[PDB]
Amino acid sequence: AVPKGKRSKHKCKQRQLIYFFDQFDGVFKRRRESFYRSFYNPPYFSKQTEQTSLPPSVLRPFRFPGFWPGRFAFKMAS
Amino acid sequence: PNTKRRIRDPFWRRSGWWRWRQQEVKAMNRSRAFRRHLFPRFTTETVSFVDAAEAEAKRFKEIVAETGRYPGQTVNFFVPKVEGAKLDPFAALPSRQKRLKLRRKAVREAEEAEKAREDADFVWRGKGGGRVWEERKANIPLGKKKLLLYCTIIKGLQITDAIDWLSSLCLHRVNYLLNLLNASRKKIHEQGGDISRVYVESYMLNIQGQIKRPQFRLRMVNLIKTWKFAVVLRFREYPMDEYFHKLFILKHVPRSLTTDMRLALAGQRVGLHAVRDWYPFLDSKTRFFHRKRLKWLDRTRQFDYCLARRVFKSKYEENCRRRKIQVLQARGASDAVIEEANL
Amino acid sequence: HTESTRRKQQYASIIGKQGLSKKRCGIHWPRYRRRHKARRATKHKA
Amino acid sequence: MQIPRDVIFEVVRGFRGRSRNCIKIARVRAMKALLYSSIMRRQRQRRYRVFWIGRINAAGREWSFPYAWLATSLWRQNIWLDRKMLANLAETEPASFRALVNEGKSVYFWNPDKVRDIQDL
RNA sequence: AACAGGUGCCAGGCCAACAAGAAUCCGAUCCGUGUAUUCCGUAC
RNA sequence: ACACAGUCGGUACGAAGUCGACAAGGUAGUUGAUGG
RNA sequence: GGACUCCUUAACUUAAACUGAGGAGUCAAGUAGGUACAAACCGUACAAGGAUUAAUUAUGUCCAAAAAAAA
RNA sequence: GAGAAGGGAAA
RNA sequence: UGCGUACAUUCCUUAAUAUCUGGAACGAUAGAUUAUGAUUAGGUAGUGGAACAAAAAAAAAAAAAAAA
RNA sequence: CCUUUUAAUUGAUUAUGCUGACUUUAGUCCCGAUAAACUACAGUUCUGCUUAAACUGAGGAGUCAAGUAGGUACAAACCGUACAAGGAUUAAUU
RNA sequence: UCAGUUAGGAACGAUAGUUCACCGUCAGAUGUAAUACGUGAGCUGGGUUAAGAACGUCUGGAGACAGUUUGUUCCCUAUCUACCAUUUAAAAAAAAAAAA
RNA sequence: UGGAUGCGUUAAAAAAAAAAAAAAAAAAA
Numbered sequence A: 001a002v003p004k005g006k007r008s009k010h011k012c013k014q015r016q017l018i019y020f021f022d023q024f025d026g027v028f029k030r031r032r033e034s035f036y037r038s039f040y041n042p043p044y045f046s047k048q049t050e051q052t053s054l055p056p057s058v059l060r061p062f063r064f065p066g067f068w069p070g071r072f073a074f075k076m077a078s
Numbered sequence B: 001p002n003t004k005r006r007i008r009d010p011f012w013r014r015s016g017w018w019r020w021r022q023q024e025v026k027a028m029n030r031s032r033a034f035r036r037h038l039f040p041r042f043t044t045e046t047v048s049f050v051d052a053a054e055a056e057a058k059r060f061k062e063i064v065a066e067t068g069r070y071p072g073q074t075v076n077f078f079v080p081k082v083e084g085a086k087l088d089p090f091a092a093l094p095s096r097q098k099r100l101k102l103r104r105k106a107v108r109e110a111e112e113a114e115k116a117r118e119d120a121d122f123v124w125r126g127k128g129g130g131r132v133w134e135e136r137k138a139n140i141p142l143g144k145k146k147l148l149l150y151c152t153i154i155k156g157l158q159i160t161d162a163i164d165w166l167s168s169l170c171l172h173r174v175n176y177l178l179n180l181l182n183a184s185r186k187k188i189h190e191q192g193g194d195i196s197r198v199y200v201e202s203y204m205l206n207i208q209g210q211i212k213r214p215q216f217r218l219r220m221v222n223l224i225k226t227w228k229f230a231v232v233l234r235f236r237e238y239p240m241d242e243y244f245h246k247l248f249i250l251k252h253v254p255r256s257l258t259t260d261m262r263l264a265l266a267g268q269r270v271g272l273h274a275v276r277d278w279y280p281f282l283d284s285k286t287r288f289f290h291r292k293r294l295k296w297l298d299r300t301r302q303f304d305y306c307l308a309r310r311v312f313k314s315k316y317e318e319n320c321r322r323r324k325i326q327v328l329q330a331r332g333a334s335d336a337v338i339e340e341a342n343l
Numbered sequence C: 001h002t003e004s005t006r007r008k009q010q011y012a013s014i015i016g017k018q019g020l021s022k023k024r025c026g027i028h029w030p031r032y033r034r035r036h037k038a039r040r041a042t043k044h045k046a
Numbered sequence D: 001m002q003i004p005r006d007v008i009f010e011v012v013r014g015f016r017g018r019s020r021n022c023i024k025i026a027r028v029r030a031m032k033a034l035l036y037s038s039i040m041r042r043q044r045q046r047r048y049r050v051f052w053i054g055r056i057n058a059a060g061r062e063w064s065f066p067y068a069w070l071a072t073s074l075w076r077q078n079i080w081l082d083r084k085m086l087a088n089l090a091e092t093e094p095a096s097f098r099a100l101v102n103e104g105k106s107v108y109f110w111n112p113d114k115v116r117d118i119q120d121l
Numbered sequence E: 001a002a003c004a005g006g007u008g009c010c011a012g013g014c015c016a017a018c019a020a021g022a023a024u025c026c027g028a029u030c031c032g033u034g035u036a037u038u039c040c041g042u043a044c
Numbered sequence F: 001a002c003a004c005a006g007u008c009g010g011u012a013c014g015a016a017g018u019c020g021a022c023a024a025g026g027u028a029g030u031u032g033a034u035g036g
Numbered sequence G: 001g002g003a004c005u006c007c008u009u010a011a012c013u014u015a016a017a018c019u020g021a022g023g024a025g026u027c028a029a030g031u032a033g034g035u036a037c038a039a040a041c042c043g044u045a046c047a048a049g050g051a052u053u054a055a056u057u058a059u060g061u062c063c064a065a066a067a068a069a070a071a
Numbered sequence H: 001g002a003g004a005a006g007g008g009a010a011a
Numbered sequence I: 001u002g003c004g005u006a007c008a009u010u011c012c013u014u015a016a017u018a019u020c021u022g023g024a025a026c027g028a029u030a031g032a033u034u035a036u037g038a039u040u041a042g043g044u045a046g047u048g049g050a051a052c053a054a055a056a057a058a059a060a061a062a063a064a065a066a067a068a
Numbered sequence J: 001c002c003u004u005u006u007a008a009u010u011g012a013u014u015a016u017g018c019u020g021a022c023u024u025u026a027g028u029c030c031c032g033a034u035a036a037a038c039u040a041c042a043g044u045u046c047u048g049c050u051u052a053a054a055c056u057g058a059g060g061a062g063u064c065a066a067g068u069a070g071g072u073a074c075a076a077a078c079c080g081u082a083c084a085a086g087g088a089u090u091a092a093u094u
Numbered sequence K: 001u002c003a004g005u006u007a008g009g010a011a012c013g014a015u016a017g018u019u020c021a022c023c024g025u026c027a028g029a030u031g032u033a034a035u036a037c038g039u040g041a042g043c044u045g046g047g048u049u050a051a052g053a054a055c056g057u058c059u060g061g062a063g064a065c066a067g068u069u070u071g072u073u074c075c076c077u078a079u080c081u082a083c084c085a086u087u088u089a090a091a092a093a094a095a096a097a098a099a100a
Numbered sequence L: 001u002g003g004a005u006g007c008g009u010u011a012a013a014a015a016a017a018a019a020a021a022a023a024a025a026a027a028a029a
Helices: A009-040 B019-035 B052-067 B096-114 B144-154 B159-168 B172-191 B240-249 B255-267 B273-278 B284-299 B305-329 B335-341 C002-014 C022-043 D005-011 D023-062 D067-077 D083-092 D094-108
Strands: B132-140 B198-216 B221-237
Touching: A009 B144, A009 B159, A009 B255, B052 B096, B096 B132, B132 B172, B132 B198, B144 B159, B144 B172, B144 B198, B144 B221, B159 B172, B159 B198, B159 B255, B172 B221, B240 B305, B255 B273, B305 B335, C002 C022, D005 D023, D023 D067, D023 D083, D067 D094, D083 D094
Parallel strands: none
Antiparallel strands: B132 B221, B198 B221
16 A cells, blocks of 8 residues: 655644654653753763763752852862 | 653644634633733833844845945946856855854943943843854754754753753764754853853754665665754843843743752752742742732832842842852962952 | 746846956856957947 | 746745645646636626625615615616616615615506595495 | 967956057956057067 | 635724704603504 | 437337437537536527626526515 | 425425 | 516727738838727637747947936 | 847657656664673673694695685774794793 | 334254255244445455366367366555544643833 | 453343533623
8 A cells, every 4th residue: 555645745744743742742851851850869970981981979060150149169278 | 651641732632622722722822921921110211122234234235226236336237146156246245154243242342331321220122132153063964854853842942951951862863963052052151151041042954965875675776865964053142131031020940940959959058048049940839929929019019120130130140250259269369360350 | 948047037137237257257258258349349440 | 838937936926835836736726726817807797796786675675665676666767877886875875875765666656547545435 | 350378357569588558537345358538569 | 724725805994082962852962653 | 430419210129328321509629607516408799808887598586596565 | 386306495 | 567697899908911801091211009990809620920939140339319 | 239140950837758856655664593790808690502622753634715704992994914944942031 | 915113033064166056953033135246455265267288079280169177476564535442731842022 | 369261150221321522691712
């Protein structure tokens, strides 16, 4: 069995939107939610990337300085 | 997965999504969205953004069309472009990137000028404005159909939100878009733009081609294609007034910012005052109830849009200035150096 | 066809203007030069 | 070609999909559009005329003088206002239309030579 | 006007070892072998 | 779009005012035509 | 070496948009109207072109749908 | 008042 | 005793090329186009007339009003 | 420009036309046979199949192909690689 | 025979490519017709209508028979209509900035 | 300590019934 005609641009656009919503609500929202929940734990440190990665760390940066009420850096010692 | 999750369909609904229903529902949605706005009840002026380079190009081309001559020509005439011509008839005009550079220059100049204008705190400016960057990446081995998904995800989001989005997807070929976003953010920061208020305003996909390979089958030989595409992203630094009206009044706050606030509170990296400090932006419930409180205060005429905007802008600017001063002090710099850094 | 129509329109747009240059004329440069030579032809020995 | 290419592309402006820019489909669509225009421009006169006729009939029936009697009366009276004018007077000049109806009645409702009073016999 | 080549593109007189104009005026943004006017060389 | 997806037509401002406006009113800027 | 309607016929099961003859009309190569809906029936003061005037053609006059029932 | 035998439904 | 309904070379604008439409007429330095002149102008096959098809070549791109 | 000419072989919605580009089918079909761990105080995961001796006086029982198919950094590069006396009697030097 | 507000139902085999039939059992309720003699992009391939080969028959022959036989690749990932399943919503993606 | 199926068991009643997905004097969202 084969198509009897060419699918139109209008219907292809409709399909684009429908598949976008399907993939969004089926994969992308869930993956983003899991990613944002993982932030409450120290970032994963792969032992196979030791040779080139940074030393292990736990701190997660606050990336909007305009909303930070505390101190940004400590004065140089002497 | 949940196996009972509600997956959305933009064209059909059980409740009835015929065209008349869509019309009525979207009229309701437009009304609600407009009523979500709080507007100042007193302003001195209604300044609107204009692009001098675009206006000059428009007038230049209008003159060329109306007189058949370049502006200032008296003897010769305008010569349109023909096949094989190596001269651009509109070479005197700036390119799109040059116009963007001139826009950034004008924005900087107007920002500096506004700091010495009386009544600058009572002026309405509107949505548009601010600096704009256009960044392009080529040779992406992805097709239009997938790029449309990945760009519809991030359109309209703050840059860090978009980066988090695309990083959460665990897709190998989205590394191209992630590289573009990271490089653009680094470039804007180095040029002095405030990463905190840079949004992805629009995208554009430009095909480049497709490499074809034979695929030998039972009765025929096919050609399988690998795409070649380029992506152009438009980043915009929102002016401080627009940033205030978006985050504070309409409660459209970056989830990256909200997550950082919640992580700080959970880890006790800030004081107890931070809870009330960040109440207007912290969570959905706090944002909703603060919006209700602001609406009631505005309807009783106790809320002051201009005073609130000034307080928000001053707090933001002072936090940034403190960051700069303390990072300088962490180096052991001299008082003269620190003072000269502020000029 | 479309190519011939486009070429004729471009030639009609450029051919009637004096003082053009090679970069302005492109593929029509020899034709434009011959046309201007023919137009000059009447000035010889006045 | 049956129609010039430029005219085809100018006529298919506002159409749906490939009909706007593909010559093969635009030609068929433009042919049909202009043929419809040609036929309907010849046909529309009587479609307007029936509208005038219905308007006049309703206006006359409002005064108890149907269109048939009104038309006979006017034509007999040597009043040659056309249907469009009569409909316009009906919808915009009610007093003048009522005067026309009264004139038509004065001719239609003639009286016999002898009239009989039989109310008390 | 085939009084060839080159010189930023259409040059008899800028170069090209043997003739003759850095000729003048006008050119949106650079240049002009271009327009207009004019002088000169040529048994080329 | 009900549509070989086109064609012919297609909304008639203000009074949204008011210190308004022939014969009666029972004063509503209301009313006059109509007994078997 | 065309089609259908009509008139007159031969063949057929007094059958077939059957086959085959003699004459007119339409189609073929003729739009828009009527006949419910893709040629051949009716009708045309038959279509160069434009327009918001008019006419009793066929045929209609309860509604779909234009068009009579004063006192 | 009729293959009014397109649908409704009329003296 | 009525009326509805298709048809305008009524108005306005074009066209007529196998020797007969006035025209064997009126003009004439190369036809301006007929105002109550006529016939008229659906059309497959076939036949015929006309107008285009932006180019090239040619030894004819300044005796042209007013302004410059 | 106009005029005259042109032998241009001069007008393409159509030949399952030719040479190509780019859409629809569609983000659909297509994913070959068994796999784990590499460790906060020792070790030996499980499975399929069984010529895996490489001097012992013996070139180690073949032919053919790879126009160099198991060299080399998580390389579809660069560089290097078939020695018939096998060169290191290198039990040396340190 | 006529009549419905049409209500519930009518089993299996031998030979046979068979349909319609014949014969046997159960039952004691022949049913008939249409749906492209419904249905092969749903199945089979026994008969039947290719290449091989054989018998009878016809010709001088190659060959043949509305005579009989044996052997002989039954494709398609479903675009649309139809149907059976199936579906949060006003919002819980993005955007929707007025008045002057 | 259990699951599925029929070769097991039960019912063959209701149709204004069992049940459902859009409360509706809201006539220009």
